[PDB]
């Protein structure tokens, strides 16, 4: 459930991420729709740009925004998010 | 098997990415280091926001400036390289 590994934002820009991801996982059945939903909701919530990666067999060097980075799990799904 | 699923680039950029990804995947066993090396090499060559991602259960739809995306399947691995 609430499992966070590496969070680089403040408490609200982590808790809102957890909540939105939770509602996304409970709504959709599609990983691609999860990614698109996170992007859309965070774009209309915080700032014009929001970039997320969702899956279970991935991992990669990535240039996020300084102070902007989060990585967590939901059941088994690695979900990462950041600003550009 | 070099198979390209989706892309939006020029042919020269796509071929450069194909060859660089081929050499990186053949060299490094772990997807993490493969993506690390690829993204660093395209940081050195092109825009310093190139994102290289790798996996077998990977998906991410993020807001982007166009013309710099590719998502292909080589052998039994999915490799993405894009810029936002």
């Amino acid at each position: 459930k609430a499992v966070i590994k590496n969070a680089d934002m403040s408490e609200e820009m982590q808790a809102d991420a957890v909540d939105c991801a939770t509602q996304a996982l409970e709504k959709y059945n599609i990983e691609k729709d999860i990614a698109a939903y996170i992007k859309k909701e965070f774009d209309r919530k915080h700032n014009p740009t929001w970039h997320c990666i969702v899956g279970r067999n991935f991992g990669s060097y990535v240039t996020h925004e300084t102070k902007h980075f989060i990585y967590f799990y939901l059941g088994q799904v690695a979900i990462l998010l950041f600003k550009s | 098997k070099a198979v390209i699923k989706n892309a939006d680039m020029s042919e020269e950029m796509q071929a450069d990415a194909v060859d660089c990804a081929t050499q990186a995947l053949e060299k490094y066993n772990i997807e993490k280091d493969i993506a690390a090396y690829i993204k660093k090499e395209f940081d050195r060559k092109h825009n310093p926001t190139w994102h290289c991602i790798v996996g077998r259960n990977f998906g991410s739809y993020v807001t982007h400036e166009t013309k710099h995306f590719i998502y292909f399947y080589l052998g039994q691995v999915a490799i993405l390289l894009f810029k936002s």
Partner: peptide, 10 residues
């Protein structure tokens, strides 16, 4: 602004 992560091989 350059980070590395993958986790929980499955």
């Amino acid at each position: 602004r350059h980070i590395d992560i993958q986790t929980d091989v499955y």
